Amino acid sequence: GIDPFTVRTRVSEGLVLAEPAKLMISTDGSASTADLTRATTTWNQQSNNLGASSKYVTSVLMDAGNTGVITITYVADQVGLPTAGNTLILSPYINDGNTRTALATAVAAGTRGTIDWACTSASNATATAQGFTGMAAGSVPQEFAPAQCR
């Protein structure tokens, strides 16, 4: 079968594919709820309404409810993953220097700060250790996820 370390390396590619979405949210999706909503629409329309894709990535999509949460869905049989074990979740927060608050909540409140991202797979130990709470769970098994998503 495929080496789990090779699988992780392919999963890491998907994370790189999401970087422009993080950038778009930073520059054009975080000044207000209206901007975050527009950014969601703009991003999701890309790549035939899949956001981004590649040999290994089916889609990189922002939550349709405008929360800014990104789901990366992998092509299981190209990466080496279980058929239903193929997603990572990237959850954004605004850091005001002292506390983290979910992006959507912070933006609605006009809270200013920098944006932090938590990556979760079937497990969330790393994000938890980094102090993040409230993330939805992904589905990539932990042994196939890179460190920041375990």
Side-chain angles (χ1 to χ4, degrees):
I2 299 165
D3 178 340
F5 299 145
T6 298
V7 175
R8 280 179 210 174
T9 256
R10 294 168 186 177
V11 174
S12 285
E13 293 240 297
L15 293 175
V16 173
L17 213 57
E19 286 302 326
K22 293 185 178 179
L23 185 57
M24 173 179 299
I25 288 162
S26 177
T27 63
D28 288 281
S30 51
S32 70
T33 293
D35 284 359
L36 178 51
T37 296
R38 183 155 65 258
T40 298
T41 295
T42 300
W43 179 265
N44 287 166
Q45 300 195 140
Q46 299 173 172
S47 202
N48 300 126
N49 300 269
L50 300 187
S53 68
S54 69
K55 178 176 171 165
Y56 296 138
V57 179
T58 290
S59 59
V60 179
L61 287 167
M62 293 178 63
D63 183 274
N66 305 114
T67 65
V69 173
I70 295 169
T71 301
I72 304 171
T73 299
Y74 291 88
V75 191
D77 69 4
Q78 304 298 318
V79 177
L81 297 163
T83 178
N86 66 334
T87 69
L88 293 181
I89 309 299
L90 312 182
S91 300
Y93 298 78
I94 280 168
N95 167 26
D96 71 354
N98 296 117
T99 189
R100 293 189 178 112
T101 174
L103 182 66
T105 301
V107 175
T111 305
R112 291 326 175 205
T114 45
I115 305 180
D116 297 336
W117 290 88
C119 181
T120 53
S121 63
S123 52
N124 67 8
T126 298
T128 298
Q130 288 167 166
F132 293 98
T133 59
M135 303 85 62
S139 64
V140 168
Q142 68 196 345
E143 69 267 24
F144 294 131
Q148 66 269 46
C149 303
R150 296 194 292 264

